[PDB]
């Protein structure tokens, strides 16, 4: 197994701009074959041996979002500073 990954439980929610139902991240990361232990607000994710691409939290964020579906992500125009 690759080394374990530490990630805040709401990190996929922040990247997506979507409040996912409770347990969505741990469930999705379990589906792809990773062992997920819950420690307060920090998940400890150990990806399976067939997923060496999962090395950082951003890698784990992609697994959650792509299984929940990118269509749920809303469209929010950012304000850029005065150029």
Which residues of this protein are in contact with its own copies, per CB under 8 A?
77-82
- Within 13 Å of residue 17, how many CA atoms lie on the same side as its CB? 9
Residue 10 annotated in ligand binding: no
Residue 68 annotated in ligand binding: no
Q: Which does 13 bind (CB under 5 to 8 A by kind): Mg ion, its own copies, none?
A: none
Picking from 67, 71, 57, the residue whose alpha carbon sits closest to that of residue 14 is: 57
Q: Which does 62 bind (CB under 5 to 8 A by kind): its own copies, Mg ion, none?
A: Mg ion
- Sheet of 35-39: strand order equals 5-8, 42-46, 35-39
Interface residue with Mg ion among 13, 18, 20, 62 (CB under 5 A) is 62
């Amino acid at each position: 197994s690759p080394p374990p990954i530490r990630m805040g439980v709401d990190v996929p929610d922040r990247i997506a701009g979507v409040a996912y139902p409770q347990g969505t991240t741990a469930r999705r990361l379990a589906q792809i074959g990773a062992v997920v232990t819950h420690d307060g607000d920090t998940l400890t994710v150990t990806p399976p041996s067939w997923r060496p691409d999962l090395r950082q939290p951003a890698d784990l964020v992609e697994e959650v979002l792509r299984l929940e579906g990118l269509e749920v992500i809303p469209s929010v125009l950012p304000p850029a500073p005065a150029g």
